[PDB]
Structure formats: C-alpha cells, structure tokens
Design a protein around this ligand. Structure first.
Ligand code: HEM
Ligand code: XE
Length: 116
C-alpha cells in the first residue's frame, strides 16, 4: 500500500505536519486556517490520509464535503495546497513516483473541498 511504501503511521504524520506548516507559511491560503487548531488539523488529516492511502484503521470522522461547505476555497487555492503536500512529501525524502501517487490520492478530495 502507498501507506506502507511511505513508511507508515509516523511517516504520514510527519508529512502532514510539514503540510500544514507549508500552508501557514503561504500568505495566499494561510488565511482559511486563521484561528484554527493546527495540531488537530494535523491529527485528523493524518488519520484521513492513512485510511485513503491503504492504512488499517479506516476514516470515521466527519464528511469532508460537508466540513468544507461555504469556506471559499477555489481550485487555484486547492491546487496550491496540493503543492504544499508535494513539497512536504519531497523534502521528506519520498521517491518521485510515490509523491505523485500520494498527491493523486490527496486530489480525490478536491471535489469535496472546492466550492468556488
Ligand atoms: C485549499 C484546501 C483546504 C482548505 C482551505 C481546508 C480548510 C479546512 C479548515 C479551515 C478546516 C477546519 C474546520 C473548522 O473547524 O472550522 C478543515 C478541516 C478538515 N480538513 Fe480541510 N481544507 C483544505 C483541504 C483539505 C484536504 C486536501 C484534506 C485532506 C488531506 C482536508 C481534510 C480535512 C479534515 C480531515 C478536516 C477535519 C474534519 C473533522 O475533524 O472531522 N482538508 N479544513
Ligand atoms: Xe501523506
């Protein structure tokens, strides 16, 4: 599973952590996460990706389409975050092919987060 090729639980965690960091460091999207609990965002998202990446414990949390309704996220902006995931995976040492495969799974949620 990509989850395994990636190195497991801790690997997805570390990558997600860097993911949000790269987000808050980007002016163009950092705004949506204003006054947002970052360690929680890191944890939930991690849980979510492990599941989507083939992990053991599947996703239980809220419906993402529902979570992000009326949030003002645009495709450009979503794309930008995806790039934050890609840079995060890259600086993490992930091999190119795996990066894109992980980013590919992340992209599936584009339809549930983008609303404008
Ligand atoms: C431009 C892209 C995105 C923006 C601006 C965004 C923004 C947010 C915000 C602001 C929240 C917090 C909700 C609140 O308490 O007010 C949230 C929660 C969440 N987002 Fe995103 N999000 C984006 C992309 C994603 C992606 C790509 C994923 C999947 C890796 C994702 C998964 C989640 C999850 C799991 C939660 C928490 C759901 C829960 O606790 O049940 N988000 N997002
Ligand atoms: Xe990840």
């Amino acid at each position: 599973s990509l989850f395994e090729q990636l190195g497991g639980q801790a690997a997805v965690q570390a990558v997600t952590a860097q993911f949000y960091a790269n987000i808050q460091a980007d002016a163009t999207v950092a705004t949506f996460f204003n006054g947002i609990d970052m360690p929680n965002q890191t944890n939930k998202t991690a849980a979510f990706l492990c599941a989507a990446l083939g992990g053991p414990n599947a996703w239980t949390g809220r419906n993402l389409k529902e979570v992000h309704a009326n949030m003002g996220v645009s495709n450009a902006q979503f794309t930008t975050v995806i790039g934050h995931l890609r840079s995060a995976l890259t600086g993490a040492g992930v091999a190119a092919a795996l990066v894109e495969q992980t980013v590919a799974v992340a992209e599936t949620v584009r339809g549930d987060v983008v609303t404008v």
